[model samples]
Target: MKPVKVKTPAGKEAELVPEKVWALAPKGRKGVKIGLFKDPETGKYFRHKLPDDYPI
Candidate 1:
């Protein structure tokens, strides 16, 4: 899988492995359409990164 580029307000940019991503997805399923989720407390966009390998 291509690297997923993510930008955080905390200045911590990281790429997640396949397993890590699955854990974040709802019901452990990454559907064709995935929403960019932001934290309620931090208000930072977390799951906004989409790798080139992803169908979305």
Candidate 2:
């Protein structure tokens, strides 16, 4: 599992360890890869689109 730093919707920085990663390809467009992360503090799960060069 790779750890990634992402900003929460509340504008807080969190270091999340990804539980899953997959591509979200849509019709007629090049889609992005998304990573699923869990917030330890709140025990909440969230998804974020990863950078192209980001390691999984």
Candidate 3:
């Protein structure tokens, strides 16, 4: 599995194991995707969504 990178709100960067991700859709929105990842060191949650062509 490929590893992913996540940055916290406080300008902290971390490498996330792909297997540890929890996928979720944006609330109150359609055709949008966001990924939730935990910081291995500090245990803080981060968002990992990118530009994509999601169907409406």
Candidate with top TM-score is 2
Better of 1 and 2 by lDDT: 2
What's every prediction's RMSD, in angstroms?
Answer: 7.9, 2.0, 5.0
lDDT of candidate model 1 versus the reference: 0.48
TM-score of each: 0.30, 0.74, 0.44
Where does candidate 2 stray beyond 4 Å? Answer: none
Query: How well does candidate 1 score on lDDT at residue 25?
Result: 52
- Residues 1-56 of candidate 3: C-alpha lDDT, one tens digit per residue: 34556576667776655334343567776544455666676777667663344221
- Encode model 2's per-residue lDDT on 23-51: one tens digit a residue: 78889898888998777767678898887
Lowest summed lDDT across 10 adjacent residues in model 3 is found at 47-56
- Give one clash count per candidate, in the order shown: 0, 0, 0
lDDT tens digits, residues 1-54, model 1?
Answer: 344555555666655332234323567676432335444447665555455356
Cα miss at 17, model 1 (Å)?
10
What's the candidate order when arranged by decreasing lDDT?
2, 3, 1
Clashing pairs in 3: none
Model 3 regions more than 4 Å off: 18-31, 51-56
